[PDB]
Design a binder for this molecule. Structure first.
Ligand SMILES: [Cl-]
Ligand SMILES: [Cl-]
Ligand SMILES: [Cl-]
Lengths: 141, 135
């Protein structure tokens, strides 16, 4: 009955504010089964070069979860190759996509991502750190 | 006869990146035509971010090889590689470990040593390596 929800976010974004990713995923649990290899990706990344096979396994498993997901939820405040790639695969798999961007960070969101948005299937919601639960509530109701 | 090549990478910095990008583009020009190389964009003023996205995808679809410099984190570049995989393009990613950065596991993990390769390199050898790949 509940939709499957993939979550990822830059490894830098999660380290700079540990609470945020926890709150996003916690609130998503109100609304569906969450899939994410975020923690694994963070750790294997750190390990770097010698974690090659672990990278392969993560790629394959995230790819599996992207295919299972009904909604892909991406925190796109910090630049990330991995999040970008997932979104690209997600677009090719015809998923519904919700990107969460913090404009206060003083970054500007990639034009590739903004230009992908159509405000229906692919939405980008600009939010402030303290309103992320209200935002997810609005989207999933 | 002459393949069409897509090249992108996040230029964030001063001269060294710009120069590295120009060195890679100039080497790619020897093997084929670089679609992506032909202030504020005229594209956004003409048709917003949507037109930019459509132009990049147009070039992606036309390309025979996609080349990504993936040292610097980039949503855009990631997204291009994601779309490119879906089109079954040949992909070459170029990573510089001496940057200090750590390559996303998703990108590292995509490598299959045929259609998706990830080569590590040092700034001084990128010419020789592109030679190895295209010859
Ligand atoms: Cl805001
Ligand atoms: Cl970016
Ligand atoms: Cl490879």
């Amino acid at each position: 009955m509940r939709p499957a929800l993939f979550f990822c976010g830059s490894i830098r974004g999660g380290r700079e504010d540990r609470t945020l990713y926890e709150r996003i995923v916690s609130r998503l649990r109100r609304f569906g089964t969450v899939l994410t290899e975020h923690v694994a990706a963070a750790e294997l990344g750190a390990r770097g070069e010698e974690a090659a096979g672990g990278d392969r396994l993560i790629h394959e498993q995230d790819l599996e979860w992207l295919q299972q997901a009904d909604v892909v939820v991406a925190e796109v405040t910090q630049p990330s190759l991995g999040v970008g790639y997932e979104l690209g695969r997600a677009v090719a798999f015809n998923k519904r996509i919700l990107c969460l961007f913090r404009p206060q960070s003083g970054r500007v969101l990639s034009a590739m991502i903004r230009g992908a948005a159509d405000g229906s299937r692919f939405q980008v919601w600009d939010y402030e750190e303290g309103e992320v639960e209200a935002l997810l509530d609005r989207y999933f109701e």
